[PDB]
Design a binder for these strands. Sequence first.
DNA 1: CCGTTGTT
DNA 2: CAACGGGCGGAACTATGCC
RNA 3: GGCAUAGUUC
Lengths: 44, 49
Amino acid sequence: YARPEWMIVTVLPVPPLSVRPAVVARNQDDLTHKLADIVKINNQ
Amino acid sequence: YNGFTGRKITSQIFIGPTYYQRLKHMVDDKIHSRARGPIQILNRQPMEG
DNA sequence: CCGTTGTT
DNA sequence: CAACGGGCGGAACTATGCC
RNA sequence: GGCAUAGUUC
């Protein structure tokens, strides 16, 4: 159930749209902003 | 004297003009009830307020 | 304030 | 002996500024 | 719509 090497994150789960809902003018959550920054750095 | 029966009250009462105040806290601004109303978005629990 | 971990 | 980290009440009601 | 701050009741 917990292999030691799995604790090194190489695949990052993305929570669904229910965990980070949009805001009604559409606003993005703190999680969404951090996800966008992370994927920006990752593709760079 | 008693109001309903008209008979004297045995104990004499202490009565006089005192200066009273009506505070801001009324009941029409505090009564509240709920039965299956609006519901929060993130948790899908009832709203607050 | 006081449970962990390091340094000595 | 020294440094570090987590822990610290319960409910409720208005208002105002800002993203 | 949300975040924050202030005041008040018990």
